[PDB]
Paper text:
We solved the 3-D structure of the Candida albicans CA3427 gene product, selected on the basis of its conservation among pathogenic fungi, and thus a potential target for new antifungal drugs. The structure of the protein unambiguously revealed a PBP fold, despite a low level of sequence similarity with previously known members of this family. CA3427 is an α/β protein with two domains organized into a C-clamp shape. The two domains delimit a large groove and are linked by a hinge region (residues 82–87 and 184–189).
Interestingly, two crystal forms were obtained which seem to correspond to a large conformational change induced by the binding of a small ligand at a specific site of the protein. The two crystal forms correspond to distinct conformations of the CA3427 protein with a root mean square deviation (RMSD) of 1.55 Å based on α-carbons superimposition of the overall structures. Most of the RMSD value results from a change in the relative position of the two domains rather than from local rearrangements. When the PEG/acetates molecules are present in the structure, the E11-Oε2 forms a hydrogen bond with Y237-OH (distance 2.7 Å). Upon pointing outwards from the binding pocket, it clears the space needed to accommodate the ligand. In the second structure, the above distance becomes 4.5 Å and the E11 side chain now points towards the inner part of the cavity. The R112 side chain points towards the inside of the groove in the unliganded structure and outwards in the liganded one. Finally, in the closed conformation (i.e. without PEG/acetates molecules), D236-Oδ1 (Domain I) and K170-Nζ (Domain II) are linked by a salt bridge (distance 3 Å) that is disrupted in the presence of ligand (distance 4.8 Å), thus opening the “Venus flytrap”. The conformational change of the CA3427 protein upon ligand binding illustrates the venus fly trap motion already documented in other PBP structures.
Numbering used by the authors: 1 to 306
The structure:
């Protein structure tokens, strides 16, 4: 089996991936996996797939679905990594008399254009009943986002930004920032994606990787105790906050055993984004693009007789 470069995001969600390596599940499947850490989200994950720097990427669902719907026929969504929805938290400065409610938002700080923090701002706007936001401050990283809403020097100011709850919880407790709203993703939060190159060149190995992840997920499920320790000792999460998170997340224990849920990964995602104004492409154009690049089956090895 050819070597496999897997791009991931160093968060609590990547826990199952770690234990799969710790317990040597990858090697057990005759695999040689080179993990590539991507601290700045799915945006770079897609770029890495486009440049063939990596074979597989584990990122947010909407990121890949939208990219495909926008005409990237070289991106393939293989399966679901996380079944439970992502909880987005809306934050603002510690002392902002001008910002107390979500409907008061005008300037929206985002890591990058097209990111989750950007896309979800539209979804939030639609649920609030207000028109989508048009003022965006590209701040690149999480810290800049916090400094921005606090109107700190060196960065452009913002009214609010959106970031994963448990990742932002630390800064609510030390009162650096202030939560004004939350919002779940209508869809499953994480998926496993690959490129057209890797899919036709390294299909058999990708399958084994998914199977290894399946075991990594089962181990996690049976060893939350160790998961809590790992997350709090290696990632920016307290043991208590890490524990709270474990009671909200549900990794796809059926990953590789059954096709992804079309309704939650594709239908809800496209219908929400389209309705929110994120996607301008027509429905049947989006459908046709997703029907070709979103798996409705599981990967399979060649039969003995070819
Ligand atoms: Ca195209
Ligand atoms: Ca290529």
């Amino acid at each position: 089996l050819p070597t496999l470069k897997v791009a991931y995001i160093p968060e609590h969600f990547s826990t199952p991936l770690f234990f799969a390596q710790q317990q040597g599940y990858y090697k057990a499947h005759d695999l040689s996996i080179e993990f590539v850490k991507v601290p700045e989200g799915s945006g770079r994950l897609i770029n890495l797939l486009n440049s063939n720097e990596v074979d597989i990427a584990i990122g947010l669902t909407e990121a890949f679905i939208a990219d495909i719907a926008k005409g990237n026929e070289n991106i393939h969504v293989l399966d679901t990594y996380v079944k439970s929805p992502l909880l987005w938290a809306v934050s603002t400065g510690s002392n902002r008399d001008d910002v107390t409610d979500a409907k008061q938002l005008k300037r929206i700080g985002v890591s990058r254009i097209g990111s989750g923090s950007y896309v979800m701002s539209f979804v939030l706007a639609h649920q609030l009943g207000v028109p989508s936001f048009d003022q965006f401050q590209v701040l690149s990283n999480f810290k800049n986002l916090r400094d921005s809403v606090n109107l700190k020097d060196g960065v452009e100011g913002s009214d609010a930004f959106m970031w994963e709850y448990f990742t932002s919880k630390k800064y609510y407790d030390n009162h650096e920032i202030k939560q004004i709203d939350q919002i779940y993703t209508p869809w499953s939060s994480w998926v496993v994606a690959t490129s057209s190159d890797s899919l036709q060149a390294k299909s058999d190995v990708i399958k084994n990787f998914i199977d290894a992840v399946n075991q990594g997920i089962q181990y996690y499920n049976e060893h939350v105790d160790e998961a809590i320790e790992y997350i709090s000792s290696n990632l920016d999460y307290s043991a208590e906050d890490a524990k709270e998170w474990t009671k909200t997340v549900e990794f796809n224990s059926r990953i590789g055993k059954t096709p992804l849920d079309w309704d939650t990964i594709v239908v809800k995602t496209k219908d929400t984004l389209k309705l929110a104004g994120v996607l301008a492409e027509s429905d049947d154009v989006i459908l046709k693009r997703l029907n070709s690049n979103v798996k409705k089956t599981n990967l399979q090895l060649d039969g003995d007789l070819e």
